[PDB]
Structure formats: structure tokens, C-alpha cells
Structure 1
Amino acid sequence: SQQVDKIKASYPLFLDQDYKDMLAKKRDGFEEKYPQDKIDEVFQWTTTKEYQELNFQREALTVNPAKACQPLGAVLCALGFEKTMPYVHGSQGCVAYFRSYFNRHFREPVSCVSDSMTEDAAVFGGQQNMKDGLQNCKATYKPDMIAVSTTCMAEVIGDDLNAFINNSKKEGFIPDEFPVPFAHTPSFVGSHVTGWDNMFEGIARYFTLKSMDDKVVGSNKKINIVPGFETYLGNFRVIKRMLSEMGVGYSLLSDPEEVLDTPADGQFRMYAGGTTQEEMKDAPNALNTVLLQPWHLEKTKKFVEGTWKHEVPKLNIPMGLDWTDEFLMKVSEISGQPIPASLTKERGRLVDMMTDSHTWLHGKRFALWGDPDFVMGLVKFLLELGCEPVHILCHNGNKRWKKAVDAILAASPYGKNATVYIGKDLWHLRSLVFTDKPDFMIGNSYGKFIQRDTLHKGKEFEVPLIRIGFPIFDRHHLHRSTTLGYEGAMQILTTLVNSILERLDEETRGMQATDYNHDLVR
């Protein structure tokens, strides 16, 4: 039933007695469900060290990964270029997923096309799809550029992107001048961030490899900035803001911030902003090229050093205090621009917040996950705040990366109880938060299910989720915030300390039992 003045959605509608009785009838009648005592008993077992040991012996089975597949990354990279349509060679199902995946995180349109290869293409390859695909895409959506990646179907049958695009130009489906950069992006290799690196080096190659003759390093007095796989609008903006404040000429290469944040003003804008082709063609003339997320830009780096002859500085992601300092100092070195009063003050304001909040943050234990650069920057900042990053999980991490993070832990007394996991997934992480319980999780929306699980063991075992990463699907507009620079450090600090105080307020909200510590002032 419904009362029209107070309509109930699924929750709490299905709590009504008649729905409840119906659900019990269904269960008892036809579901042949294991008895509740057996369920409780197996649940309890899945929280144990014994279970954890079995869990960690998995070789073939992955459960609840914390990574996605290459072409996702290629699409995001493509979107950062002016009037550029991302185009995935292969099957259309993948493009539906890529679009919806980003739709849900950004709450924006996400434009992408497929050339819809089907079963038939296993006999003859996807050449005709590419010809009709590019012609159709150019005529219909009017991009100034098409950036091509691949699905795994296309990779397994061995389509030659280079030859196919060349043939499409040769047989007059698209003008010879029309830019069609491409990259192979096999999803059984690496992860979504690898797709970004591949796409980017693809595009950089397209505009610079054949024109290196007249290039002169430093002749345009700018610094190229390569952002990598980046899903916070604030992060693109803080980089641009800091460099502008410094009076530093710069070129941000792949810049999706406008097309991921168009106004609702009565018209739909398929394209907005983005790196120009002219900016890519000119980039070898920069002073140097800075990689914001080096641990997934290795192919790009080899190209930039090998062909542009830029000497890529050894910089960590500019996260937290030390690494933001280091970023600014190196940019100052390269550019000749001194660090301005406004940035020095911002820094001192972050440091003030750290002294303000340190007594609540001190010694707090965290489980966290994400992509390698994000995770190590989060680790570093946690250590700066005097927190303990106990469980560090990077599903798509590698050995060398894990050694560098382990080096960062070793240099801090706050690293003593920390462990870095690579190739491990959120079902592994679930075990760790049960057996070696931390105070919070920092992670994406998938972590909400681990929090549910801990709560089920008991309120005292609950580990609350703090949402920072990708994807965040169950809160609105978090994609607008910032995690890089002094600004993102400020945002992260504020989120951490206030999650701690929210949780304390909840634990002390009980009248006469625990509210002796329900302080007005904290």
C-alpha cells in the first residue's frame, strides 16, 4: 500500500509488514536457502585469519578488482584534445560501458564512438568498419580530430590500426590532412592508466615525429605538463592556477576540464576547450616536459626524451606538502620564475591547518587503494599528517613502484606498521580490514561494500569509508574537488579530520551512556 501524502520508495516500502511476510514466504517456500545459523557461521569464518590465508593463496580468481581496462584510459585522454572524438576500433558493447562509467562519475555527457565490429570481422578483419566508421564519424559529429584505440576483440584478431587508417585515407573516406592519431590499447595488458599512456604517446607521435627538424628546445619558453589519467576537475584547474600565479608559460597536454563541465544553459555542447593541435605540434619547442603522474607515463616519457630531447625531471605527483614544494621548485628552476608570495602564503596556510588538526589525526590508521601515483601521494601526505597507512593496496601496481613506496614508508616512523600490496583486490582488502582493523578506509565507491561487511560483524568492527579516488558513484559532485597541490592537501586534510570527528560524534551521541564526551568544542 501507499499513502499519497507520504509515498515510500523501495526503502522503506519493503519494510511494511505485508511485504515482509511475502518475502519470508518466498524464501521459506521456494529458495531452499541455507539456514541462518549456517550463514552466520560462514560469515564469521570469512572474517578470520584462517580465511585470510586461503584468500591470499588465490592464483586464478580475482574478486572485486580495483582497476579497469586500457581503452577506458584512451577515451579520457582523447577527450582532452580540442574538438576531438574518441573512437574505439572494435566492438560497441565496450563503448557503451566506457561512456556510462564516466557518465556516472562526472554526471556529464561523454562522447565516444565505436565502429561496431561483429562476428563477421573474425573472417575478414575490421578494415571496412574503419573506413565507414571514420567517414560516418567525421560527417555526423564534425570533430577536428579522431583519436583511435582498440577493444580486445580487435586486438585478438590482429587488426593493423596504422594500415587501416592509411587505407581509409588512400581510398578517400577521410581527407589525407585530417588528423587520425591512434594507439593499440589491449585490455589484457596493464590497466586503464596504460591505455591513457598509449593514447597520449600515440597523439604526441602523430604531431611531432616527422617534423623534428626545425624544433629548438626551449625556444617557446614554455613547460609542457602531462596530467595522466585524471578524474578530478580541481586537479587540472589547480595546476593551471599555480603556474599562472607563477607567471610560467605552460602547455597542458590533454585538458578535458571544459568538456567535462559545460554549463546547462539551454544547449548541448559536444566539444569544449581542450589542447589545440597547434599546442601539440609546438610542444617540442618547450623548455621541458613535466609528467604529473610518472608511474603510468613511462611510454610517453621515452618518447618525450627520445624524440623531443627534453630532460624529464624526476618528480613525484605533486601531492601533499613536500612533493608540492618539490614540484614548484623544479618548475622555478626550469622556468626561471621565482615562487610568488601567493603560493608561499597558501603553503603556510596548509601548514597552519596541519598544526590545527594534528591531535585528531595523529596515529589514525588507514586502509587505502587507487592507481599508483595517487596512492603513493596519499601515502606520503598521510605520513606528513602523522597518520598510519596500514593497508596500501594498488591492484595495478608493480614491483618497482612498490619498492619506492616501501622506501617512502621506511623513512618515516609513521610507516612502521604499513604494508604495500600489488596485484591484490578488494576481496583481499576486505580480509585485511577484518584481521588488522584500521580506523578508516580511503577509496572509491566499491569500498562501501566492505564497510557494510564490517558493520555486519558489529558496530565496534565497522570501518567507515572516506571517498577519494575513482569511481565515486554514490555521492554527487565530488569530481569537482582537488587532491593535488596545497589546495588538494587542504581539502584532503579537512575531509580526513572531519570524518574522524563525525565518527566520534556518533560513538558519543548516546545519552547518559557515552555523551559525557559529546563535546561542543573539538
Structure 2
Amino acid sequence: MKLTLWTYEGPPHVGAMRVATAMKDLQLVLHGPQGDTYADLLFTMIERRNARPPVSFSTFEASHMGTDTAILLKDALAAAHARYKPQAMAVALTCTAELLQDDPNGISRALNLPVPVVPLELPSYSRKENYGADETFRALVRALAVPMERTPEVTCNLLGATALGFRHRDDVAEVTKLLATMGIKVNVCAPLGASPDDLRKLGQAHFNVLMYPETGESAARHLERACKQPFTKIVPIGVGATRDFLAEVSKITGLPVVTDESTLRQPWWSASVDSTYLTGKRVFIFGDGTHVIAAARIAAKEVGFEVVGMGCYNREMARPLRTAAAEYGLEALITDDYLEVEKAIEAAAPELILGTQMERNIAKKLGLPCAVISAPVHVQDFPARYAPQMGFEGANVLFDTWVHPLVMGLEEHLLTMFRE
């Protein structure tokens, strides 16, 4: 038992929803207690979604337990199908359903519907939200993707964009356009926007852009062996990272590297005399593996901060993060305890924090400038405006985002100084 208040990640079945709601023409059926539908809030409220998530619960409760629970699952499945006629479905277990004997796969096949029902295995007590998204998506792909003829034109997939993803919407927009300036067209982008019938057409791409390891890696690895498709190892967040990413793509495809930089303004903003007080400002960086690794490079090598603490909440990125941290002379903090973070921050005594919504609150408690660099999504860090983290515009967005709280801090500090 672990005494718990704040949680950076939800249960794995929420990650499942995250993949299902991302997609289209796919119903997900969770075997779970009445109540677990609270997770719809997340999608309809935070992401502003205009439709119910394609998720439904068997809804057992106290008066219909025992041998009824398996029956209620069969109905849940049956109904979802009759009502929505999706291209495919997925079935999984909530943590409460996990303590029962009901075989989703048994129940599932005995009903046999005219579409595939992919059973997912999400260990609710050892793993979390991110893995669940990853596993679900790998499971969907393993069940639907077949090897295919390559497309005439040089094309690629986009792997790992999901529902409650930090800036997935605009990241996908920005990455598409920077790939298209090299004449690389996108085949399917998944899960986000993809249907099960799109998962079947994955094979025909030349390679894959692995946008988010936390939600895409398993599926990327399957696609590598099953379709002889390489996948990009570099996540294009930061100017340095984007060039390296394009470089990587160039070597994967043999295409020359082309950029549009006419609107890239970060390098000059950071070079400009106006930035010199940024030099050596002590930054603490927390969030998920991917964004932390990316943030730290921009901080050190692009903005001229001194990276003074570095870590993440998701175990799955512990090693790439450890490798990254060493290059800065730091030992990676790996924890999901925000009280552990509150301590590592007090110790590191930074002048600015780049974290999640929680770090924002710790930052306020300590009276220090802060910017949000990764999920968990709150409604605010879900903009109506164009707000990518990736590629060249992304780099512009990040500069404004991070520097602003710094200037507001210096400015508040100065105002009160000359008031007497």
C-alpha cells in the first residue's frame, strides 16, 4: 500500500481509452464497475471533444456480481457492436475487473462478432497510463498490420499521437509540414485520426516517424520486424534535435535534407543581446522522459541555461534519461512522488522550473518562475491557438513559453524593489 495524493499517471486502462478515443471506427469495451466513466471528463472536458469517447463499461455493481459479471461483459460487447458497427473493437479490464475470474478473450471469442475484437492485457497494479497506451496500440497494430508493397512515392507513418497527449494535435501538423518540405508524404498517422482500416495500410510506408516513445515504441518495434520499416530515434523538439531528426530521415530515405527557416526565429531571439541575462540561469527540468530529454538540450545548448536538476515520472524512460543526464554531469531523478520532486527542487535551488502542472504549483509555493513542458494535461495547456512543441515553429513557441515567466519574475521583483 502506498499513501497517494497526486498521481502523474492514471491507470493503464485510461491509456487504453487514450488510444481508442484517438482513433475512429473503433469501440473499446472495459469490464469495470459503474463509476469508472469519470475518465470521460478528461476527454470531453480537457480536450474539448464534441463527442462521447468510443468507450463503454460493462457496469457491474453490488446487485449484479458473481456469475453475472461475465454475462454483463458479453452484453457490453454485444451492444457496442450492434449500436456502432465499428471496423474493430478492443476489450480490456479495469483494476477492479482484474481481481475477478472473467476471461475477456474467452467471452470475446465465444460471442464471435463479424469484426476483430482485440483483447488487451493491462496489469493495473504494476503498470500505469502510458504503458497502457503503448500496449493497446502495439496490440492493435500486431492484430491489423500486414506486410505490403511499398508506395510509389516515398512515404512514412507517424506513430504515437494519442488523445490526452501534450501538444499532439499541433505537433502532428508541424511534423507533417516539415516532412513535406523534403517531399515526404505521410501515409497513416496513428493512433490519432486513424481507423482500424488504416492500421491495415501501415505496411506500405517506407519508414516510421516515432514521435512519442512513451506511446509509440512497441508498435514501432513490431513494425520494424514485421514490415522491415526503420523508425526514427530522434524526437524533433528543439532546433538541434530537428536538424538531427531531418538528418536521420535523410539517411533512412536517401533524400536530400530541405528546410524552410524563413519563419524560424528562436536562434536569433536567443543570440540577441536581449537574452544575455539568461546565461547561467539555473533550470530544473521534470516531466516525462521525452520532453525532459528534449528540454535539457534546448536549455543548455540553445538558451544557455545551466541544467541543475533533471528527471521524470515514467519508469519506461529511465535509461534514455540517465544517459542524457550524464552529459550534463547530473544523476537522473526517477520518481512518481511529487514530494520527492519538491525535495529535489528545494535542494537544487533553481531560478526556473520546467515541469508539469504539479511543478507549476510547487513553483508557486516556493515563489519561483515556472513553465509547463509535458503532460499530465490540464485545460489551460490545451490551447485553441497553434502551439506545437516540435520542429521550427515549436522552437519559437518554447522560447516565448519559457522566457516569459522569467521576465515576469524579474519585473515583479523590480517593481516591489522601487516602491520605497
Q: Give the TM interval when normalised to the shorter protein.
A: 0.7 to 0.9
CA distance in 2, matches of 1:387, 1:510: 26
- Matched to 1:155, the amino acid is E
Q: Secondary structure at the match of 1:203?
A: helix
Q: Which residue of the partner structure matches residue 88 of structure 1?
A: 30
**In the superposition, relative to structure 1, how do residues 479 and 94 fare at CA in structure 2: closer, same or farther (>3 Å)?**
farther
Q: Which residue of the partner structure matches residue 119 of structure 2?
A: 182
CA contact (8 A) 1:235 1:483 kept: yes
Q: Secondary structure at the match of 1:123?
A: coil
Q: Quick check: 1:149 aligned with 2:62?
A: no
Q: Quick check: 1:444 aligned with 2:360?
A: no
CA contact (8 A) 1:219 1:286 kept: no
The structure 1 segments of at least 4 consecutive aligned residues displaced by more than 6 Å after TM superposition are none
Q: Quick check: 1:370 aligned with 2:311?
A: no
CA distance in 1, matches of 2:194, 2:319: 35
Q: Which residue of the partner structure matches residue 382 of structure 1?
A: 299
1:60, distance to aligned residue in structure 2 (A) = 4.7
CA contact (8 A) 1:367 1:389 kept: yes
Q: Deviations over 1:363-401 (max 9, x none)?
A: 222223222212211222222222123232312225xx4
- Matched to 2:155, the amino acid is K
CA distance in 2, matches of 1:149, 1:217: 34
- Matched to 1:67, the amino acid is E
Q: Counting strand residues as a fraction of each chain, which structure ranks higher?
A: 2
Q: Deviations over 1:338-383 (max 9, x none)?
A: 33342x4455x33223313641322222223222212211222222
CA distance in 2, matches of 1:471, 1:341: 32
1:83-482 to structure 2, matched below 5 A, reads 83-96=25-38, 98-109=39-50, 110-111=52-53, 112-119=55-62, 123-124=66-67, 126-141=69-84, 143-169=86-112, 174=113, 176=114, 178-208=115-145, 211-212=146-147, 215-216=148-149, 221-229=154-162, 230-232=165-167, 233-256=169-192, 274-313=193-232, 315-342=233-260, 344-346=261-263, 349-356=265-272, 358-384=275-301, 385-398=303-316, 401-411=317-327, 415-416=328-329, 418-454=330-366, 462-473=367-378, 475=380, 477-478=382-383, 481-482=387-388
**In the superposition, relative to structure 1, how do residues 340 and 108 fare at CA in structure 2: closer, same or farther (>3 Å)?**
same
CA distance in 1, matches of 2:64, 2:309: 45
CA distance in 1, matches of 2:405, 2:154: 44
1:238, distance to aligned residue in structure 2 (A) = 1.2
**In the superposition, relative to structure 1, how do residues 442 and 118 fare at CA in structure 2: closer, same or farther (>3 Å)?**
same
Q: Secondary structure at the match of 1:508?
A: helix
1:489-504 to structure 2, matched below 5 A, reads 489-504=395-410
CA distance in 1, matches of 2:358, 2:136: 27
Q: Secondary structure at the match of 1:367?
A: strand
**In the superposition, relative to structure 1, how do residues 424 and 71 fare at CA in structure 2: closer, same or farther (>3 Å)?**
closer
1:141, distance to aligned residue in structure 2 (A) = 4.4
CA contact (8 A) 1:360 1:497 kept: no
1:13-52 to structure 2, matched below 5 A, reads none
Q: Deviations over 1:501-522 (max 9, x none)?
A: 11111111137358xxxxxxxx
CA distance in 2, matches of 1:291, 1:122: 43
CA distance in 1, matches of 2:72, 2:153: 41
CA contact (8 A) 2:33 2:61 kept: yes
CA distance in 2, matches of 1:484, 1:390: 24
CA distance in 2, matches of 1:104, 1:419: 38
CA distance in 1, matches of 2:125, 2:370: 30
Q: Deviations over 1:177-212 (max 9, x none)?
A: x2433322222232211011111112112213xx54
**In the superposition, relative to structure 1, how do residues 277 and 432 fare at CA in structure 2: closer, same or farther (>3 Å)?**
closer
CA distance in 2, matches of 1:452, 1:346: 34
CA distance in 2, matches of 1:161, 1:221: 40
Q: Secondary structure at the match of 1:113?
A: strand
CA distance in 2, matches of 1:333, 1:479: 36
Which ranges of structure 2 fall in alignment gaps of 5 or more residues?
none
CA contact (8 A) 1:236 1:255 kept: no
CA distance in 1, matches of 2:166, 2:384: 7
CA distance in 1, matches of 2:85, 2:166: 26
**In the superposition, relative to structure 1, how do residues 437 and 199 fare at CA in structure 2: closer, same or farther (>3 Å)?**
same
Q: Secondary structure at the match of 1:148?
A: strand
**In the superposition, relative to structure 1, how do residues 345 and 161 fare at CA in structure 2: closer, same or farther (>3 Å)?**
farther
CA distance in 2, matches of 1:296, 1:492: 22
**In the superposition, relative to structure 1, how do residues 161 and 291 fare at CA in structure 2: closer, same or farther (>3 Å)?**
farther
CA contact (8 A) 1:319 1:377 kept: yes
Q: Deviations over 1:203-253 (max 9, x none)?
A: 112213xx54xx345667421220255231211211222223332122243
- Matched to 2:289, the amino acid is P
Q: Deviations over 1:98-148 (max 9, x none)?
A: 211333432334513212133577633743223211232233345444333
Q: Secondary structure at the match of 1:239?
A: helix
1:421, distance to aligned residue in structure 2 (A) = 1.0
Larger radius of gyration: 1
CA distance in 1, matches of 2:243, 2:411: 35
**In the superposition, relative to structure 1, how do residues 220 and 200 fare at CA in structure 2: closer, same or farther (>3 Å)?**
farther
Q: Deviations over 1:137-181 (max 9, x none)?
A: 233345444333321122332533333222222xxxx4x1x2433
Compare 190-199 and 59-68 and name the one that shifted more: 59-68
TM-score, length-normalised on structure 2?
Answer: 0.87
CA contact (8 A) 2:160 2:216 kept: no
Which ranges of structure 1 fall in alignment gaps of 5 or more residues?
1-58, 257-273, 455-461, 515-522
Q: Secondary structure at the match of 2:91?
A: strand
Give me the CA root mean square deviation.
2.9
1:441, distance to aligned residue in structure 2 (A) = 2.1
CA contact (8 A) 1:289 1:312 kept: yes
CA distance in 2, matches of 1:513, 1:158: 69
CA distance in 2, matches of 1:152, 1:105: 24
TM-score, length-normalised on structure 1?
Answer: 0.71
**In the superposition, relative to structure 1, how do residues 105 and 375 fare at CA in structure 2: closer, same or farther (>3 Å)?**
farther
1:69, distance to aligned residue in structure 2 (A) = 1.8
CA distance in 1, matches of 2:299, 2:93: 38
Identity of aligned residues (%): 22
- Matched to 1:503, the amino acid is G
- Matched to 1:163, the amino acid is G
Q: Deviations over 1:301-346 (max 9, x none)?
A: 3422332232334x1322112221122122233344433342x445
